[PDB]
Amino acid sequence: MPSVIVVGGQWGDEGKGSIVAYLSLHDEPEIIARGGVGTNAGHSVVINGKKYAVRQIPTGFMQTKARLLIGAGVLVDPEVFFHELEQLKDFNVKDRVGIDYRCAIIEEKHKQSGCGPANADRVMRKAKQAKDVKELEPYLTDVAQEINDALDEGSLVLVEGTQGFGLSLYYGTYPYVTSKDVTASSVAADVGIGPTRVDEVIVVFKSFPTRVGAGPFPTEMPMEEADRLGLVEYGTVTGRRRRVGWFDFEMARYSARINGATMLAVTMLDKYDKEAFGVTDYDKLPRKAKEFIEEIEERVGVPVGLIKTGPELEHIIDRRD
């Protein structure tokens, strides 16, 4: 059934984790594969007051009745993998987690995240694979296999990528980008699925774009201003203070076009307008809020099917009728 690919249209941290979590529970997909680079991104989600952060395992772990797979095109770090298996032991992920036996491994000599150096040898065919380490075996499998199997069985499959279009290796702010393409097409290749097998493509966006480290930020705002509006965010893995800037409709439109976005997702709308916090019904949104949304759909050319009005799961407006 309608396979959904979730990717970011900015510079990562758009809240891809929250969206995947919502869909995992509301839609109840049978498979939740993870794509992208590796563990250099910690997708977070707030489950009833408790904040979570995963870098290896998909952000759909809350859905016990579903397998969590990791695409072959994704780098795996044994240290973080097992760490999260313990952190999520309450969800019994260790029983439904599968790592493609063709995934590249991130060794300490790479970490010297290590995703960059890892891919360096990856394309140089010098790094080992998942089936080369003993610790990783009871989880090995063929993600491309299971995904296609369920896909033919009309089963729902949800895949999530990492980073954002802005960090794309091809269409990103080179050289200030990741070590690979993060478009919906790439994510599909990471899990082993044909482009014609993809039904829906959701490009996530957040009221205020953010950056991590050097890089061109046209809509960037003085951090002094980011403090007044209260948009100060810290990396879930580095604790680094991300740079903030106002929405970039131009980029949003472009990033949504190349990704062939069939749906748009907006998050942290409450940060743009306090009067929108908790809203579940679009019609119950304040003028200012509706203005922003409508403006996005007209500037991007794609309708927003999901709107996050808070960090909690219930804080979201689902209009995918």
UniProtKB/Swiss-Prot annotation:
PROSITE patterns, A to Z: ADENYLOSUCCIN_SYN_1 (PS01266)
Pathway field: Purine metabolism; AMP biosynthesis via de novo pathway; AMP from IMP: step 1/2
Gene Ontology CC annotations of this record: cytoplasm
GO molecular function: adenylosuccinate synthase activity; GTP binding; magnesium ion binding
Localization per record: Cytoplasm
GO BP terms: 'de novo' AMP biosynthetic process; IMP metabolic process
Cited PANTHER family: ADENYLOSUCCINATE SYNTHETASE
Quaternary structure, from the entry: Homodimer.
Family to which the UniProt record says this protein belongs: Belongs to the adenylosuccinate synthetase family.
Record-given protein name: Adenylosuccinate synthetase
Organism the protein comes from: Pyrococcus horikoshii (strain ATCC 700860 / DSM 12428 / JCM 9974 / NBRC 100139 / OT-3)
Gene (name only): purA
